[PDB]
């Protein structure tokens, strides 16, 4: 179902210019995050750039983390993912949220700033403990 | 557990040629996706290709997700993984299931017809409902 | 919740000189994979290096399927990513536990015995079970 993530916001345009990150529709698995930048950012074939989002979120329970990945239209037709290729977030993670921007593609492109560049899947994952063994059972 | 996923075929082939997405043991996390090509593909060094899957899906939760991802074996030993890394299926896509295929590797591969080229894992995911704070809370 | 995974130690290293993979802290998603060498590896930009973790897991229910990722800094920093970029690892597969190392940065890179070199993240998965339609209902 549904789970509660405090958002601090780090950069007063989120909310205002440039809306906080949501569920485009209903059935999005992804909330889009934007690129706070003071002006157009260029990203040369292969460079790589840590962006802004203009906030920090928390999400405080143990089985949840989030992960960062790219657009997919934007990552397949113009080569813009991310340097880490995909970015987890811890639940006990409270500092800036940034984006790793990598431009994987033989063209320069440019984003503008408020522009989405990623986005961010909130999921439930297990926590493993491991049993030592010299051969698998089962 | 388990969860109905709508299937359109759109390629004749599948079922018939190329088997449907499957699990290939009962352990499986993924179901592999097949190149539905009219010839073998060679795909250069750094190049990008939109591949079709001769399907569309639709998940039809709003609490499922589908990630396509590249396969183990392929993605490491030749490079054939996916120009936009991950790829994020939500709930209510309804549109052609396709696969950016990239060959990040130093030399041509070549992809058949049929030829599985990653692979379409279904997770649960969570709703996240924000709140704005000025700090963050336990 | 918890999860118990079987792990079969085959570097004497692991639990020893090397920490078994363990959550850094109570929120971490992520149990860090760490590279079981013999000596520094320096890993040339664009080169692709499969580096033993020193172990093998067998996850065990069908339902739980991990995955390997980069490390957020490392992956950023140093590009030092996954020549598969996501490693997904199938609740039946029982053998050695590897990281294809892929350095896509523009400098060379040494890695140490020991080092963190990606994470794994252990998650629920469903199981899909199509249904082919004509026309997608709802």
């Not at 007063?12 to 909330?31: D, H, I, M, N, V």
């Not at 006990?92 to 408020?114: A, F």
Request: proline share 7%; charged share 20%.
């Amino acid at each position: 179902m549904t789970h509660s993530v405090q958002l601090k916001i780090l950069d007063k345009r989120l909310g205002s210019e440039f809306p906080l990150p949501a569920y485009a529709t209903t059935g999005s698995a992804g909330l889009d995050l934007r690129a706070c930048l003071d002006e157009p950012l260029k990203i040369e074939p292969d460079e790589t750039c840590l962006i802004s989002t203009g906030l920090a979120i928390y999400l405080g329970h143990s089985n949840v983390a989030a992960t960062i990945l790219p657009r997919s239209g934007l990552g397949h037709k113009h080569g813009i993912v991310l340097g880490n290729l995909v970015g987890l977030i811890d639940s006990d993670y409270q500092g800036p949220l940034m984006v790793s921007c990598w431009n994987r593609g033989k063209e320069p492109y440019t984003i503008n700033p408020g522009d989405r560049i990623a986005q961010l899947v909130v999921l439930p994952i297990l926590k493993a403990q491991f049993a030592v063994v010299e051969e698998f059972e089962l």
